[PDB]
Structure 1
């Protein structure tokens, strides 16, 4: 569990940063604050909308937020009525204005955060993790994902002792930096306590 986080070592490699913007040493601090703020706001408000990830950019002292989501219609709302409000609210903490660019994930079951949020939505319903894991692995293999390693840890269906469990399938070369491997860690609240869900997804050799 102390093993290296796969995304961090490939940030200079095959994993471009979710927020790509330069700033001077003075305002960089505040811009990180605002970044964390908008990421929280968009996280909470769009939580039920199953956003996969939010790609911040800040050209010319103005923010442009790309948004990869599983269900673009539920995010946008009826004919964009939400989008504008999302631009106003965000712009207020963004330093003004707030451009936004929607984007749909063609294969949402592949993407890690969508999978984890699904598994959490199953766990809150008291669904059995032993089924959830095999279901995720089933969808991953049906899409032909080159590799996968699902892992979870916690109370496990009310057991008094916390326990780790996992189920890998396919080739999983974590040591190979050439590898195209998505990854996520998402906590799942339950009546007995938090249950961490880690999800490795090996998409391709390059």
Structure 2
């Protein structure tokens, strides 16, 4: 009957920021219009390997974008012509330059996000995703974590059918503000309407 975030409530406690910047009394408003715009271009340019963390720092309002993506080599491309585009389009909206910093998503198996970017791929085949769903969860937990719960909502059958499915491969203490837990979500579609997935990953006790 609740959905209760472990993250967010805890920015300085094992669970680090999606973004952080210091804009002043009469210089926030444009920074906020740019924090969705810069993330929309990137999270469509980086889709080919996802982005666990789409990190917006702005060291002098110029934007130090740190992209933890599971394939940096495909966004370095054939060696740095994409980087050039990647440092221009997000700087075109913001009116200032853009300190593009790359990284790997170190093992998507154990990750704070990339488990939901298994699952929400599986729907692009349109056939029996049930063969692979709870197997993907299984596989992920075989290289890391100690419990996980999963909730999936949406049009996932035929004609008019709309339900919610819930699974538990291991124990999850829902909120413990000391622990290495995460919450995440992701999305998918199937030509009848939405398919929206949610996770809770109790990876460790502290």
Q: Secondary structure at the match of 1:51?
A: coil
Q: Secondary structure at the match of 1:9?
A: coil
Q: Secondary structure at the match of 2:16?
A: coil
**Following TM superposition, by how much is the alpha carbon of 1:10 offset from its aligned partner in structure 2, in angstroms?**
2.8
Q: Deviations over 1:121-168 (max 9, x none)?
A: 211211433233222221122113111112211222326331111211
Q: Which of 7-16 and 63-72 deviates more?
A: 7-16
Mark the CA change 1:79 to 1:54 in structure 2 (over 3 Å): closer, same or farther.
same
Q: Secondary structure at the match of 2:54?
A: strand
**What TM-score do the two structures reach when normalised by structure 2?**
0.90
Q: Deviations over 1:71-98 (max 9, x none)?
A: 1111221112200111012112233110
**Following TM superposition, by how much is the alpha carbon of 1:38 offset from its aligned partner in structure 2, in angstroms?**
0.3
* Matched pairs, number: 206
- Is the contact between residue 109 and residue 141 of structure 2 (CA under 8 Å) also seen in structure 1? no
Q: Secondary structure at the match of 1:65?
A: strand
Q: Deviations over 1:33-52 (max 9, x none)?
A: 11111001111222223222
Q: Deviations over 1:43-64 (max 9, x none)?
A: 1222223222211101123210
**What TM-score do the two structures reach when normalised by structure 1?**
0.90
Gaps of 5+ in 2: none
Task: Give RMSD over aligned pairs.
Answer: 1.9
Mark the CA change 1:46 to 1:131 in structure 2 (over 3 Å): closer, same or farther.
same
Mark the CA change 1:174 to 1:5 in structure 2 (over 3 Å): closer, same or farther.
same
